[PDB]
Design a protein around this ligand. Sequence first.
Ligand SMILES: [Mg+2]
Ligand SMILES: [Mg+2]
Ligand SMILES: [Mg+2]
Ligand SMILES: [Mg+2]
Ligand SMILES: [Mg+2]
Ligand SMILES: [Mg+2]
Ligand SMILES: [Mg+2]
Ligand SMILES: [Mg+2]
Ligand SMILES: [Mg+2]
Lengths: 110, 194, 117, 134, 59
Amino acid sequence: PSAGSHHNDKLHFKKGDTVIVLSGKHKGQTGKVLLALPRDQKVVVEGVNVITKNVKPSMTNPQGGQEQRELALHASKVALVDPETGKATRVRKQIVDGKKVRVAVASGKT
Amino acid sequence: AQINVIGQNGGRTIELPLPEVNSGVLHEVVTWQLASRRRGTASTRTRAQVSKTGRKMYGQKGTGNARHGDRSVPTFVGGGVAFGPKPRSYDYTLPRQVRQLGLAMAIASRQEGGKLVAVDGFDIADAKTKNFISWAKQNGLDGTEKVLLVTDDENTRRAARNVSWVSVLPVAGVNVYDILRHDRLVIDAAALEI
Amino acid sequence: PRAKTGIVRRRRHKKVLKRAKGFWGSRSKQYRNAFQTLLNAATYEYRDRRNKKRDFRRLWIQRINAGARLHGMNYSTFINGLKRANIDLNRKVLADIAAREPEAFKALVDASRNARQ
Amino acid sequence: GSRKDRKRVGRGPGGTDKTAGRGHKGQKSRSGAGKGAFFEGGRSRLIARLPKRGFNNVGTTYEVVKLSQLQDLEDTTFDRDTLEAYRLVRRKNRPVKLLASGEISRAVTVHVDAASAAAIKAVEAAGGRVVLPE
Amino acid sequence: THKMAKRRIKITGTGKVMAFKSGKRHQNTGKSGDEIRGKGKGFVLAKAEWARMKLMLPR
RNA sequence: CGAGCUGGAGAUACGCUUUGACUCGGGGAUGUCCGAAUGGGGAAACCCACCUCGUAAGAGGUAUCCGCAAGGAUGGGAACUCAGGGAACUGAAACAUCUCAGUACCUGAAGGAGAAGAAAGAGAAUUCGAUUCCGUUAGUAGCGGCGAGCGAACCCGGAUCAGCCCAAUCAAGCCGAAGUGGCUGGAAAGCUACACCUCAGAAGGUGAGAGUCCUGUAGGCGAACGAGAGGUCGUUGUUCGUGAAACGAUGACUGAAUCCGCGCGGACCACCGCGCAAGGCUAAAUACUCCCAGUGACCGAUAGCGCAUAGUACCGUGAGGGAAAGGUGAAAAGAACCCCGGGAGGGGAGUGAAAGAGAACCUGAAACCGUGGACUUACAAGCAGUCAUGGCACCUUAUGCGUGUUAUGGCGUGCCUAUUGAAGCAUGAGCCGGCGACUUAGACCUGACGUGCGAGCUUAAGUUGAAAAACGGAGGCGGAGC
RNA sequence: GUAGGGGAGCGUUCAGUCCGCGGAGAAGCCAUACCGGAAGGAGUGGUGGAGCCGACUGAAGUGCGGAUGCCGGCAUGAGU
Ligand SMILES: [Mg+2]
Ligand SMILES: [Mg+2]
Ligand SMILES: [Mg+2]
Ligand SMILES: [Mg+2]
Ligand SMILES: [Mg+2]
Ligand SMILES: [Mg+2]
Ligand SMILES: [Mg+2]
Ligand SMILES: [Mg+2]
Ligand SMILES: [Mg+2]
């Protein structure tokens, strides 16, 4: 039960965005959004990861082996932040699109 | 016998309760007040009746090492509670003389120290919340006290919203508790005052 | 609101239990039998506390007339002659004077003799 | 300050718990534990066997208005038919009656529903009038 | 109790109880003349203690 | 709504989405079979038919009950309402009247509410003016083996307040203010230094303790379509038990007047009042909680609903009864590889802050079983202790009035309950957890202490504000007794 | 000193204030020779891993050895 639905189960970020790490570890490191999971609040950035070993009863002469793969994340990160660091961007508006909004803090480029 | 912070004068009225600040009556008053607020909500299955159980058991005499009637009794597990809480009230009317003697005795209890009456709230300038911090700093409120504001004028109250500094009490709806709880009482609006 | 018995009983019990030490078997281990051992234990405590004084009385005396007899008198005779002399209100624990220091006790004997005939 | 706020100093004592008390096992040994039947009265013991009837009525009852009250203090505001409610007879429910208790000479004129003998024999000897409904 | 009103449990101004003399009331008479006027006023305050409680609120 | 989606599903594969998927508010369209089940049968979910259109496949109809027919009803619903029927244990310290009590239960009808209603009346002022509801009158009038007990109504204060006709805004959601450095740390939201917002410091999430990091909060906006008569006999009701028993109400016999008339006013009479029966409907204020929301001097895993979902397992032919059951980690990084073993299981390595978290994964008491150690024990009669001394071992509240263990001496009849009396050969109990018993209520009664006013003292229902409390004098208690 | 009456208090849950403490680690559990007239309360040391003392006031489902008491767990009879 419970589970990640504390937010409105909406994502402040998008699938194709560059994003950095607010606090946490690998502080301020950045990367492209890869996996965006809204319900469970999970984000995969190209940036941060682990070395995870595979238990493999059958894989290509199964003989199990180790891989190095990406650790998923919470809402903790900073989402598409232009002026060379992370900051909270609320504001919306229209620029070239009647049907579309955009995002900024002090600036207007995401 | 007290000053106003902006504009006029007055507050030389209001003979204060005698003797000055009797805390027994105070205690009586607040205790009554919390008691008034107290909302009885009782989750208890008291009776062997409340909980769900079929009631005839097994042999009385002759089973041995036994002795029981039913599974719903309080000497059992899962069963009813003997003397658990029920949905009551505990709200009464404290005699009115003391109801009005109290708050007066509180205001009186603010004459060993700081209290304030104000007029001319126009120094607030809409709300902005900032100008309340200003108004405070100029009127001597460090915000290292706890403050209660009693006034009308929604513009003037709504300037104050925060946990640290202040709390707000409209239309002279004052509580002996609320004012005795906070450090500074700003009696502000001089309507109920004087 | 309810108050579960939690950590209250346990504490008390643990205290009782700790009072039980070199107690044999069940006594030292499980509560009830410990506690109820400690009732009779009370009885013997206070009563023997009033008692050990009767006990030591007995012991000291039992030494004193022993030495007296080594010198030719007895407790009856020795304290009779000693106290017959307003000289000795000496009394208490005098046993160790008979035990440790013989010559002294001898002098007290002869004193008890001069206080007789 | 609520935390420096004291007690009543002797309004209440704590309640009564019969749990514990190391040798409390409460009430009476046999007989009269457990029951909701105690019941001090009842026809059994010396109430019946007691011999009365008479009969119940309790008809008209009147406000007792002390003379001492009326005289002495106030103004002799000439009590009459209305102001009297503020004079503390307060009843309604019943008519008003005047009786003689205190003595002071005064001119007084009062509307009540009835009065006693030495009442009218008092009010007039000091001068005055006492009205009665026709 | 609520029966005892018109019968004399009756309460005085000193908070005492009116119970007088029963000696013979109706049946079985034909002794003297002042045992017949033996009907009294009277009371005791031992069982007056719990008596009023029968009559309690309605004085 | 604007990037994800492919149900709890943990899982691989196939794929869908900006030509707006998924999710959310709104309609429609499909909807096997059983069940009021209704073509007929039937051991519910199966078995057999028949009529109509046809191009087979397929569609429609085929129960009964009131009607011109349109059209209505069959059944279901926790509790709430009215109605037909109606107990007993129990109290009376036994028991017939009585009480329990028109209580429980059965049954019938209906709705979101019901019931009840527009005076042949209350009532004693020639006042009031439909019903219901709350306060109060009041334990008062009264009822009663005049026992146990039962117990009104008018007045008055309110919530809400209408009589009218027949027969001669909330709904999906969008918008939304304000922080960086250094520091401890595995991890910052904590500490520190400066800084800002606030009609927004309610709350939750985020590796720990959050105004300014996410979601939100105040505020603002927000739709196509959608919802807002008389008597007699037998009886009984209300306080009404046959009592002087009036009046309503019928079961059986009877059976008048109609406006110079009729019913009432507690036997009855005359005065005197109040009313005009035999025809119907009538929101509102009242009751309840299947259900949704919000809060709590409510619980937090023997509690709390039976259930941290199960009426399941499990018991019973059946009606019916009926369980216990929670926790890796912040994150799966959930342990590749190696060793002993068929395995189970563990030992390394590695991930991790921690594996003193390893999936018999939070803590981890006690009973209970062991392993090692210290001091001890194989002539001693033992409620297991207690005191006194000696030996021996140990020195973190701790070299002393020590701590542990012991040998000897003295003393020493478990606990509880029930009792004239208990070590009792009298009850209870295997041991340890955990659960487990003097309570709550009422405008009650009486007393003690304390407080406010004080010959005065107070409000109840309710109204109004409700982070908060004021108003509300109907009434109650003193004040005169016999 | 038994029923019984009177007086002072200890401890536990919740609530309002007050003061604060905690990842350089909360409660809980473990041991312990110290404190107090008792209920009891601290000192430090070991466990633990997310919370909690102290003070005042108020409210209680508030204190267990018993009830052939209740749920559970684990013993004895026995390697019989
Ligand atoms: Mg007993
Ligand atoms: Mg030492
Ligand atoms: Mg006992
Ligand atoms: Mg006895
Ligand atoms: Mg025995
Ligand atoms: Mg025996
Ligand atoms: Mg064998
Ligand atoms: Mg054998
Ligand atoms: Mg054998």
